[PDB]
Design a protein around this nucleic acid. Structure first.
Ligand SMILES: [Mg+2]
Ligand SMILES: [Mg+2]
Ligand SMILES: [Mg+2]
Ligand SMILES: [Mg+2]
Ligand SMILES: [Mg+2]
Ligand SMILES: [Mg+2]
Ligand SMILES: [Mg+2]
Ligand SMILES: [Mg+2]
Ligand SMILES: [Mg+2]
Ligand SMILES: [Mg+2]
Ligand SMILES: [Mg+2]
Ligand SMILES: [Mg+2]
Ligand SMILES: [Mg+2]
Ligand SMILES: [Mg+2]
Ligand SMILES: [Mg+2]
Ligand SMILES: [Mg+2]
Ligand SMILES: [Mg+2]
Ligand SMILES: [Mg+2]
Ligand SMILES: [Mg+2]
Ligand SMILES: [Mg+2]
Ligand SMILES: [Mg+2]
Ligand SMILES: [Mg+2]
Ligand SMILES: [Mg+2]
Ligand SMILES: [Mg+2]
Ligand SMILES: [Mg+2]
Ligand SMILES: [Mg+2]
Ligand SMILES: [Mg+2]
Ligand SMILES: [Mg+2]
Ligand SMILES: [Mg+2]
Ligand SMILES: [Mg+2]
Ligand SMILES: [Mg+2]
Ligand SMILES: [Mg+2]
Ligand SMILES: [Mg+2]
Ligand SMILES: [Mg+2]
Ligand SMILES: [Mg+2]
Ligand SMILES: [Mg+2]
Ligand SMILES: [Mg+2]
Ligand SMILES: [Mg+2]
Ligand SMILES: [Mg+2]
Ligand SMILES: [Mg+2]
Ligand SMILES: [Mg+2]
Ligand SMILES: [Mg+2]
Ligand SMILES: [Mg+2]
Ligand SMILES: [Mg+2]
Ligand SMILES: [Mg+2]
Ligand SMILES: [Mg+2]
Ligand SMILES: [Mg+2]
Ligand SMILES: [Mg+2]
Ligand SMILES: [Mg+2]
Ligand SMILES: [Mg+2]
Ligand SMILES: [Mg+2]
Ligand SMILES: [Mg+2]
Ligand SMILES: [Mg+2]
Ligand SMILES: [Mg+2]
Ligand SMILES: [Mg+2]
Ligand SMILES: [Mg+2]
Ligand SMILES: [Mg+2]
Ligand SMILES: [Mg+2]
Ligand SMILES: [Mg+2]
Ligand SMILES: [Mg+2]
Ligand SMILES: [Mg+2]
Ligand SMILES: [Mg+2]
Ligand SMILES: [Mg+2]
Ligand SMILES: [Mg+2]
Ligand SMILES: [Mg+2]
Ligand SMILES: [Mg+2]
Ligand SMILES: [Mg+2]
Ligand SMILES: [Mg+2]
Ligand SMILES: [Mg+2]
Ligand SMILES: [Mg+2]
Ligand SMILES: [Mg+2]
Ligand SMILES: [Mg+2]
Ligand SMILES: [Mg+2]
Ligand SMILES: [Mg+2]
Ligand SMILES: [Mg+2]
Ligand SMILES: [Mg+2]
Ligand SMILES: [Mg+2]
Lengths: 159, 204, 137
RNA sequence: CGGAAGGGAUAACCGCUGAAAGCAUCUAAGCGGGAAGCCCGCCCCAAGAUGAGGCCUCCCACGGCGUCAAGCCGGUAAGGAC
RNA sequence: GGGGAGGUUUGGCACCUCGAUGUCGGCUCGUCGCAUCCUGGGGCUGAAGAAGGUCCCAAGGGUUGGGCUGUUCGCCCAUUAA
RNA sequence: CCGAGCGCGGGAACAACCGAGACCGCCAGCUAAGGCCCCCAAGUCUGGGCUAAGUGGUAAAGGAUGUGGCGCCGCGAAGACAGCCAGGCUGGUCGAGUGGCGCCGCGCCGAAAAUGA
């Protein structure tokens, strides 16, 4: 948690950093300790649901950190002939086998990048945001299970 | 949300560019605004439009003050037009450009106590093999001990027509401001003389 | 012969509703609605206090209720069984949810309806600033 | 000329972040997508909605009995009926 | 080979009704259930595409005309999104 | 037991289920079954567990890392299960438990019908 600026509140935690500040809804019955330059958290007991709540926030907070730190971004491959993508200012239009060129809106906090017609990174400050947006694209043209086409994260081929 | 009162004047057909077009002619004389109601004074937005001239003697009513409150020649009729605050003091056929599609409300013709066949376009009965008693009848109307009653809203004969009817998306054809006339795509509720309102449609 | 009461001035009351469990609240409201708390009680006459409630939307409700609870409006017509879940009530007119709870706990008779009038409900707060307002919990 | 468009919430289902259970999971906290269907939107009725709603305008004291109180008889106003 | 749901079939029992609860078909008028025939959504496919298979969600609406028979049903002609 | 107690209380309602065998009167008292949050008389009574399905508000074979409680077997600080590096169980790293079976309590699925619930 170096260089950060995590500031505790009643039911939430405001984490700041080079990238910026971001709110993270924290559970009620949890102790967000701010030991030293780092941060800890402890649970009121040792019940089934409490364990879940600890590990959840335990990570959910660590994301607030990394988020304002190094930031997040996911790649996107694009197979098939006509299948490609041209960045257009903020938004990106990509023809991928449809008679209508797909215009993709750029949500706030997110700024996807296009290094190549086939490759596409998705810059962002929030795992929740980035994760959705990434999928939001694969959704535009899932991987044809009969050969290579449509967009891919970077994972194995559907074959 | 344009709007304007008028009277169905009649209907005949004109020739567009080279094809015939059946059109109704409405007359939406100059309608003086009589009261603009805001969300402050009332709770909605709308305008009271007057219509035909009136014998000042016939309007001895308190309406005289309502007319004076806006300083306008006593009109014969006046209705509101929801969500529509214009300009000036009078609306005109100028509000409608040819090509714009409008909704026309009106009062359908009065058919009084009409039969079920007449009213709900029922089937009635056979003219030949059957009893000469149910030729134009509704036949059955229910079941047995269950429900043992008749469904509310069952279609039956009764007073019908002579009611508020709104036809929609009628395209406005040539509109003559020179005489306050307004042509439309023909079918429009009411008899030749009935007060009708003409609004903006919902195509999108 | 047991005591025979006489005309009594309506005692008004102001009630909160934030965090209050729907029913637990409705009970007391009902019991105060009829003069059943005052020892000069008489079923015959009906002289319950004018209860006024505020902050309706604030009402709590345990477990799956906003999603589970269903309200039935039957019209006289076929298939008119129209049913509405709790969440929708608070969206539209939320005051209803407390009303349809109190109304249910009042007696069925004619004076029971006369009692449902004594009950005033809003969510704001800000009642019609009349006169009485003896707060309570 | 109409069935819509459109907004909102969902079904099966697809998915993001994510513990419990170092991994993994659409879920346990949370969030997004998704039906000719649900809510609304259109059209008609509609304040006996006795919970009888709002606005604009017009007319407006008592002339005689009941000692407070509730009423009764007549000429009227705006206005209404025949 | 095993467990069940439904109460459309055939039937068991004899409980109201024998000082009367008119029977099959058709017509007219429908309305409801969903275990969905079509249209909408979706999973798997021995799913290349188109077409189709099975299962899931979903009543809003729709669900033709005729030959034969008293027929219900069924067969058949011509079509349909069905 | 009803019949003959369709007289009373309870059970929503209801001959025969639970309580009880009504000579008359009373603006007296103790109870019975059943109940004591409101409609509805009396505890939003006390203490100790369980249940998140409205289960409770009433369905089976059979299915499932539901939740809690009890007992046993295999590996483990001579480093185990899991993941990450390398080779094809072994090594390293980390570092405290982990995997399988059986029984009890409550619960989930299986669970589609016709006028409005
Ligand atoms: Mg994945
Ligand atoms: Mg007038
Ligand atoms: Mg209007
Ligand atoms: Mg005929
Ligand atoms: Mg005959
Ligand atoms: Mg005859
Ligand atoms: Mg009946
Ligand atoms: Mg004429
Ligand atoms: Mg407050
Ligand atoms: Mg129904
Ligand atoms: Mg239906
Ligand atoms: Mg008040
Ligand atoms: Mg005050
Ligand atoms: Mg899907
Ligand atoms: Mg898929
Ligand atoms: Mg993880
Ligand atoms: Mg995952
Ligand atoms: Mg959730
Ligand atoms: Mg699940
Ligand atoms: Mg959503
Ligand atoms: Mg949506
Ligand atoms: Mg939809
Ligand atoms: Mg609707
Ligand atoms: Mg009205
Ligand atoms: Mg009125
Ligand atoms: Mg009024
Ligand atoms: Mg005067
Ligand atoms: Mg005077
Ligand atoms: Mg005077
Ligand atoms: Mg005087
Ligand atoms: Mg006069
Ligand atoms: Mg069988
Ligand atoms: Mg049967
Ligand atoms: Mg039957
Ligand atoms: Mg039988
Ligand atoms: Mg016998
Ligand atoms: Mg008989
Ligand atoms: Mg008889
Ligand atoms: Mg008879
Ligand atoms: Mg018979
Ligand atoms: Mg036939
Ligand atoms: Mg189904
Ligand atoms: Mg089947
Ligand atoms: Mg289609
Ligand atoms: Mg697929
Ligand atoms: Mg399929
Ligand atoms: Mg296919
Ligand atoms: Mg295909
Ligand atoms: Mg049907
Ligand atoms: Mg319908
Ligand atoms: Mg046929
Ligand atoms: Mg024939
Ligand atoms: Mg024949
Ligand atoms: Mg046969
Ligand atoms: Mg043949
Ligand atoms: Mg044949
Ligand atoms: Mg054939
Ligand atoms: Mg053919
Ligand atoms: Mg005996
Ligand atoms: Mg005996
Ligand atoms: Mg009895
Ligand atoms: Mg009894
Ligand atoms: Mg008996
Ligand atoms: Mg008895
Ligand atoms: Mg006993
Ligand atoms: Mg005896
Ligand atoms: Mg005793
Ligand atoms: Mg109790
Ligand atoms: Mg307690
Ligand atoms: Mg069961
Ligand atoms: Mg079982
Ligand atoms: Mg299975
Ligand atoms: Mg199985
Ligand atoms: Mg628990
Ligand atoms: Mg168990
Ligand atoms: Mg090891
Ligand atoms: Mg089910």
């Amino acid at each position: 948690p170096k260089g950060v600026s995590v500031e505790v509140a009643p039911g939430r935690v405001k984490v700041k950093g080079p990238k910026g500040e971001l709110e993270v809804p924290v559970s009620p019955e949890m102790r967000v300790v701010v030991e030293e330059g780092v941060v800890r958290v402890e649970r009121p007991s040792d019940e089934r649901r409490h364990k879940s709540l600890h590990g959840l926030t335990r990570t959910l907070i660590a994301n607030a950190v990394k988020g304002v730190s190094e930031g997040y971004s996911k790649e996107l491959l694009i197979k098939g002939i006509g299948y490609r993508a041209r960045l257009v200012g903020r938004a990106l239009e990509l023809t991928v086998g449809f008679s209508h060129p797909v215009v993709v809106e750029p949500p706030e906090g997110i700024t996807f990048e296009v290094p190549e017609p086939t490759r596409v990174r998705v810059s962002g400050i929030d795992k929740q945001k980035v994760g959705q947006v990434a999928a939001n694209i694969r959704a535009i043209r899932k991987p044809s299970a009969y050969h290579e086409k449509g967009i891919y994260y970077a994972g194995e081929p559907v074959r | 949300m344009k709007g304007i009162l008028g009277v169905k004047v009649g209907m005949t057909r004109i020739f567009r560019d080279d094809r015939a077009v059946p059109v109704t002619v409405i007359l939406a004389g100059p309608c003086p605004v009589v009261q603009r109601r805001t969300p402050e004074k009332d709770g909605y937005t709308a305008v009271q439009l007057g219509f035909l001239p009136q014998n000042p003697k016939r309007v001895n009513r308190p309406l005289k003050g309502h007319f004076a409150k806006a300083g306008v020649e006593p009109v014969r009729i006046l209705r509101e037009i929801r969500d529509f605050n214009p300009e000036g003091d009078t609306v005109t056929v100028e509000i409608f450009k040819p090509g714009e599609r409008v909704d026309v409300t009106g009062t359908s013709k009065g058919r009084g106590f009409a039969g079920v066949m007449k009213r709900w376009n029922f089937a009635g009965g056979p003219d030949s093999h059957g009893a000469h008693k149910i030729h134009r009848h509704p036949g059955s109307i229910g079941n047995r001990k269950t429900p043992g009653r008749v469904y509310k809203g069952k279609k039956m004969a009764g007073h019908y027509g002579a009611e508020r009817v709104t036809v929609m998306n009628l395209e406005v054809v040539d509109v003559i401001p020179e005489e306050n006339l307004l042509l439309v795509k023909g079918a429009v509720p009411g008899p030749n003389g009935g007060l009708v309102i003409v609004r903006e449609t919902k195509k999108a | 012969k047991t005591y025979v009461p006489k005309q009594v001035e309506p005692r008004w009351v102001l009630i909160d509703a934030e965090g209050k469990t729907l029913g637990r609240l409705a009970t007391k409201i009902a019991t105060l609605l009829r003069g059943k708390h005052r020892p000069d009680w008489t079923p015959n006459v009906a002289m319950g206090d004018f209860v006024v409630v505020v902050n309706a939307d604030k009402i709590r409700v345990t477990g799956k209720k906003l999603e589970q609870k269903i309200y039935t409006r039957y019209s006289g017509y076929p298939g008119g069984l129209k049913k509405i879940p709790l969440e929708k009530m608070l969206a539209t007119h939320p005051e209803r949810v407390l009303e349809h709870a109190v109304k249910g706990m009042l007696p069925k008779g004619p004076l029971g309806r006369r009692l449902f009038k004594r009950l005033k409900v809003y969510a704001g707060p800000d009642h019609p600033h009349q006169a009485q307002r003896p707060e309570k919990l």
